[PDB]
Amino acid sequence: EGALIRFYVEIEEPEKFLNCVPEELKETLLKEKRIYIDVFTTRPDTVFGATFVVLAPEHPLVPVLACIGERLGNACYSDVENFVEKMKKMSTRERTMEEDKEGVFLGVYATNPANGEKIPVWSANYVLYEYGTGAIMCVPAHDQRDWEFAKKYDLPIKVVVKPEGAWDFEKGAYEGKGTLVNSDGFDGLDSETAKRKITEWLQDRGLGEKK
Hints:
AaLeuRS_CP1, monomeric, alpha+beta, globular, ligase, Leucine--tRNA ligase subunit alpha, two-stranded antiparallel ribbon, Isoleucyl-tRNA Synthetase, domain 2, 211 residues, Editing domain, monomer, 6 helices
């Protein structure tokens, strides 16, 4: 159990990017001006502190978004192709055991449905296509693997679960329970009921669902 959350890439002029979107995504694209990235989390109470999105290397949206990223002059297409082909050679065991985080920027920015903030979309080794939806939202302040990744590629850290005791966030991530900060009208809530309240709030907006 947890939450499916609908992050989305806003595309201002959908028409000029149609030549690298698959047929079954074209409709939603030229009417909502969106490509959705379904994400699975067990920490929906941390959603306000997402500063990036990661897709598994084998996720079908990787070549799609990278094409778009290229068009906008924000990504290196060959670097992504190289990354995906290399990562496809590895087994599950080999990717989990990797001490170092490797990733590539796709050149696009997802919209965080919790606060409307634009965040980079990356692909990375530690994310497996098989688990959940093949995509995660990343909260470096509260997820240790995302913390290492952000450290490795100079990505923003943002605190949304304040601990009772003291903690230093530029030395590591706090993965425990606390009080919500920088979380709109969910500030002050304890983490556990925030999981329920944010999930239900997103569910009612058609941008989430309980799992």
